[PDB]
Write a protein that binds this ligand. Sequence first.
Ligand SMILES: O=C(O)COc1cccc2ccccc12
Length: 167
Amino acid sequence: VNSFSGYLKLTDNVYIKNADIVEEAKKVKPTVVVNAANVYLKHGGGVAGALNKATNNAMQVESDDYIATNGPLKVGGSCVLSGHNLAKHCLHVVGPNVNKGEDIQLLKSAYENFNQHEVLLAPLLSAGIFGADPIHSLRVCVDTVRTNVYLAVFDKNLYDKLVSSFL
Ligand SMILES: O=C(O)COc1cccc2ccccc12
């Protein structure tokens, strides 16, 4: 048993809810919250900015020190940092950004990072301002992630569309 509530079960291991991932993280305090990061860990908008804002910029301070030491991530890659006041850990995962011209085939590599964690709270990688088709991102998630993933979909209209089209 775990603490996630009101999710719709899609498969053996994938669950989904219409929820603000920030509000969800604050309530559940999951072991792992996934950030939809970029390779620079510059948390400007979307899930990265919202999460970072909820940490009072501590996520961005930590991230700047990580980049100063290690250099940028790879598209498709990840790193584990603090979850601050939101979670034990934050898994910063870089999905391809279609609005920057990155290869959508890297989305499967991005979701493979989730398999290193038994349970995660996550957004739909490469959806929203990342420019990929969220229906596609949900299908890659289901077909790639084998660990237990709780997907928060911010937009109510998108949530309804994802559920109604899910095979
Ligand atoms: O939750 C959703 O309605 C769809 O996902 C997203 C919405 C807006 C911004 C996003 C940025 C990164 C990844 C997903 C995002």
